[PDB]
Design an enzyme around this catalytic site. Structure first.
Site, mmCIF file in Angstrom:
data_model
loop_
_atom_site.group_PDB
_atom_site.id
_atom_site.type_symbol
_atom_site.label_atom_id
_atom_site.label_comp_id
_atom_site.label_asym_id
_atom_site.label_seq_id
_atom_site.Cartn_x
_atom_site.Cartn_y
_atom_site.Cartn_z
ATOM 1 N N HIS A 1 29.291 77.984 67.250
ATOM 2 C CA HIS A 1 29.872 76.813 67.909
ATOM 3 C C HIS A 1 30.422 75.765 66.923
ATOM 4 O O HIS A 1 31.071 74.817 67.370
ATOM 5 C CB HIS A 1 28.938 76.172 68.961
ATOM 6 N N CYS B 1 21.980 71.444 64.175
ATOM 7 C CA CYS B 1 22.337 72.823 64.500
ATOM 8 C C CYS B 1 22.466 73.637 63.235
ATOM 9 O O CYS B 1 22.948 73.125 62.252
ATOM 10 C CB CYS B 1 23.592 72.857 65.358
ATOM 11 N N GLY C 1 23.380 67.084 64.759
ATOM 12 C CA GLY C 1 23.574 67.454 63.367
ATOM 13 C C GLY C 1 22.530 68.431 62.863
ATOM 14 O O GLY C 1 22.596 68.867 61.713
#
Ligand SMILES: CN1CC[C@H](C(=O)N[C@@](C)(C(=O)Nc2cncc3ccccc23)c2ccc(Cl)c(Cl)c2)C1
Ligand SMILES: [Cl-]
Lengths: 297, 302
Positions: free
Chosen positions: B41, B145, B143
């Site tokens: 993503h 991820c 932030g």
């Protein structure tokens, strides 16, 4: 979202853990530059016992590589083994003495190998409710400040109630404890009030508002209540330190104190705060800020 | 003595954390050898998220579109492939701090350490479990991820989780290190919600054995139960069914304490019934389910 008991990343400390053997005893050492620090009980007239020891009596092992001890001195209850090899993985560090209520990470070690990392607090009775087995002596407590590891604790012993006792990295014990075989007991413990309030601010930030109320209190009325429930007195410095969280949530410190006053008299009543049925005191106001803002190392 | 929620030393994982930037998005990557793994993503916008065609968005990407930063040193991406929901950025530099590692997929009830990172920098380490509803109850901000879950048994790091998203209830969903999501979750902005969560029964029993080892016997009773009677009671308190596999796994703890598994099951039944009544078990006023039988053994033995 989420709130966890979070420890500092243990990596910088991991590269410092060594095995220290002297006679039948094997415990852990902290290798910083060309010195290995460890509990002096590895060798009770300790000056007299240390004078009888030779450098080759201490077998220091860093991973597989054996280090050769070229000198030894004692500073309070810590032994300082001078080694020939400087630790190439030595981080930027300080030796700091922490106050009760302050939290830190413990890298628990056995035979110079790190087994786990956990977060705990210096209790007001100067003990730490740690997790230690035999061989864990020399495991250190620390905080990370930007890129600097602040060593604050070295494990020496377990008290009869299972709680733990140790020293700062200068060999000064936390609390009225001694490294001698004698009867010692942890005193009556109190709850770290500033930390409970900080953990209540973390619950408000995370969506938990059930415990909030329209009431406020004086700092004196709060302390008269807190004293009855074995809670540490809340000072004006604690109120000042909680300021940023008070601003972020919009709940004044004495406003949250009145929430805590009701929680102590009435209880949780089947409810939980951050998945806990008890009031948590092992998160300082800075821990809550670091976790709910994203500070990195 | 003592019982703590203990995490694995994060050092081996720390040397693998990198920053991965693609357009306006900055998240974390796991740099192992000459490959950097991260959630796919990273290539999406917020509008793309409703119905993204990842193969289509990845074909439009150049190697220089991904800015990978390992500390201060910028890494050069020399290739990119997608495996399920993980993006694999081939880099021209191999990680010298690459540990002995494995990619393991864990089952619900399994615990692991999470090294939470922001901008490729580790901020903290915590222990958590794969919930029966396939979410994790983590501590993550935006932030995070690309932050990973792991177990460090022996000298090998078993990577089992990569953080991908936060669900509407504040719980988190992610994938194994092969990009396969845990649970019925997708990396697409849909009406997905975590299913009803249940207590990990085998872990509560393991934590009760840790309490017995630590001196806490108040909750024990003179009763035993059948496995079927226990499950009929457990189901009513939203507890996971205890299988014969779970009873077998608790065997070593049962032998060490001298309390049979169905005997400890009868203690659990009474605790679900009565509650704690002002008492605590290992300093907890609730029954803990984030310690597996393997965690209890490791911590109470070595
Ligand atoms: C304020 N923005 C609105 C949307 C952004 C958003 O949530 N984006 C993410 C990347 C996401 O889940 N990120 C996060 C992760 N962990 C914890 C988070 C705590 C808080 C905020 C985002 C957190 C995301 C979103 C949708 C999907 Cl389907 C996926 Cl796979 C990922 C945030
Ligand atoms: Cl598993």
């Amino acid at each position: 979202s989420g709130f966890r008991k979070m420890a500092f990343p243990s990596g910088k400390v991991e590269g410092c853990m060594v095995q220290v053997t002297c006679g039948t005893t094997t415990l852990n050492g902290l290798w910083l530059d060309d010195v290995v620090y460890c509990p002096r009980h590895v060798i009770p007239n300790y000056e007299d016992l240390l004078i009888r020891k030779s450098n080759h009596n201490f077998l220091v092992q860093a991973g597989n590589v054996q280090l050769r001890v070229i000198g030894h001195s004692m500073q309070n209850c810590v032994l300082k083994l001078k080694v020939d090899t400087a630790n190439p993985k030595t981080p930027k560090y300080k030796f700091v003495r922490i106050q009760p209520g302050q939290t830190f990470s413990v890298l628990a070690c056995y035979n110079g190998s790190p087994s786990g990392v956990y977060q705990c607090a210096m209790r007001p009775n100067f003990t730490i409710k740690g997790s230690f087995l035999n061989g864990s002596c020399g495991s250190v407590g620390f905080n990370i400040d930007y890129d600097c590891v602040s060593f604050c604790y070295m494990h020496h012993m377990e008290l009869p109630t299972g709680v733990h006792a140790g020293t700062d990295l200068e060999g000064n014990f936390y609390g009225p404890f001694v490294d001698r075989q004698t009867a010692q007991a942890a005193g009556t413990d109190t709850t770290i009030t500033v930390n409970v309030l900080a953990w209540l601010y973390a619950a408000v930030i995370n969506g938990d508002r059930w415990f909030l109320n329209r009431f406020t209190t004086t700092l004196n009325d709060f302390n008269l209540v807190a004293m009855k429930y074995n809670y540490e007195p809340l000072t004006q410095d604690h109120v000042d330190i909680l300021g940023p969280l008070s601003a972020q949530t919009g709940i004044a410190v004495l406003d949250m104190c009145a929430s805590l006053k009701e929680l102590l008299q009435n209880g949780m009543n089947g409810r939980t705060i951050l998945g806990s049925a008890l009031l948590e005191d092992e998160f300082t106001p800075f821990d809550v800020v670091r976790q709910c803002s994203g500070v990195t190392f």
